């Protein structure tokens, strides 16, 4: 199957108008064929969310959620380091999914930092083998 991809992108053909995007866990298996330009011209690795970007992604998940008038996001940014942008949202949702036990409609961020700190740190215990090659 490679040979079809490889020969059609080493053509003998104009792919200029068409566009292609490739994704993987690691660029270990891609061979010198796909790591070569042509087929794969550019490479953009994802990086861990910066704390400045972490504040942003936090902001977009606080919108639909209902909170108390007293809110401080920086507490979460400082307490949450190295997490994945998905894992941040899972933590926000877990903060809300912890409020249903308290049955309260409006939820303060104190209860949030409770669920955040505890559960997120549990994610760190399950974070083994997260280191991935370049």
């Amino acid at each position: 199957t490679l040979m079809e991809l490889l020969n059609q992108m080493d053509g003998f053909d104009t792919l200029h108008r068409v566009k292609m995007i490739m994704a993987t866990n690691r660029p270990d298996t891609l061979d010198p064929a796909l790591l070569r330009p042509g087929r794969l011209d550019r490479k953009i690795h994802i990086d861990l969310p910066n704390e400045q970007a972490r504040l942003d992604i936090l902001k977009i998940h606080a919108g639909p959620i209902t909170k108390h008038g007293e809110i401080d996001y920086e507490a979460i940014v400082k307490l949450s380091d190295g997490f994945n942008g998905a894992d941040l949202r899972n933590v926000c949702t877990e903060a809300g999914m912890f409020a249903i036990r308290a049955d309260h409609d409006f939820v303060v961020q104190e209860d949030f930092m409770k669920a955040v700190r505890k559960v997120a740190d549990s994610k760190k215990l399950e974070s083994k083998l997260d280191y991935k090659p370049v």
């Binding site: 910066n50 704390e51 400045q52 307490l79 380091d81």
Partner: protein
């Protein structure tokens, strides 16, 4: 290619490689720190930072800038448990130099002696190689300031500007262009570059309280640690 106990002990691979020291090389990444060493004409600047996960952290106890000699400071990387063990032996060897030879140590020979002991850790397979990274400075008579580094390969090293560790690979290539050209180095020049190499890698631009900036200059040769108040002055000086 691996055969026998060579993964568990210190020997030569079928290709001649050593597995333990290459593991200790990446042992620094578990510390998650960064250290940059820049030397000027009359000066040398050392910049680092620290992590403050809890508001209960004391800035004084967790400071990563260690002072071996009144005129010679140092810094470390990776885990601190291993660095501390090397601290007291650095100091001990400084004092024995001062006792035996009656004069201050060039610091050139300090990293060499230390690196010999590091060879012993590399040789014996029944003891831990101690993969902490040693970074030093020094002052020599009419030789200007000096910057040394030591890695747990059992060897000594020292250059103009050298930065080794987790993210230091990218800071290096950034420094190589700033050094030359023809660019000369003064005091405020080096101080102002210390943050540029950190920003290009990080670009966090945060409170100066987390970062520690060491310097060694020949005015009063005594090593001095910079206060946050003056550090912030340089930080607002570089941003116009």
């Amino acid at each position: 290619s691996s055969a026998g106990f060579d993964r568990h002990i210190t020997i030569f691979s079928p290709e001649g490689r050593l597995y333990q020291v290459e593991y200790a090389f990446k042992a620094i990444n578990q510390g998650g720190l960064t250290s940059v060493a820049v030397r000027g004409k009359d000066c040398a600047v050392i910049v680092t930072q620290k992590k403050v996960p809890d508001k209960l952290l004391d800035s004084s106890t967790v400071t990563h800038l260690f002072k071996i000699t009144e005129n010679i400071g140092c810094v470390m990387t990776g885990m601190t448990a291993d660095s501390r063990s090397q601290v007291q032996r650095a100091r001990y060897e400084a004092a024995n130099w001062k006792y035996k030879y009656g004069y201050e140590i060039p610091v050139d020979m300090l990293c060499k002696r230390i690196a010999d002991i590091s060879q012993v850790y590399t040789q014996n397979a029944e003891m831990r190689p101690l993969g902490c990274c040693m970074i030093l400075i020094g002052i020599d008579e009419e030789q200007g300031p000096q910057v040394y580094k030591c890695d747990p390969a059992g060897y000594y090293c020292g250059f103009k500007a050298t930065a080794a560790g987790v993210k230091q690979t990218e800071s290096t290539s950034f420094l190589e262009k700033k050094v030359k050209k023809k660019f000369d180095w003064t005091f405020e020049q080096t101080v102002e570059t210390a943050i540029t190499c950190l920003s290009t890698v990080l670009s966090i631009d945060f409170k100066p309280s987390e970062i520690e900036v060491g310097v060694v200059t020949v005015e009063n040769p005594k090593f001095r640690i910079l206060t946050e108040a003056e550090i912030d002055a340089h930080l607002v000086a570089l941003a116009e």
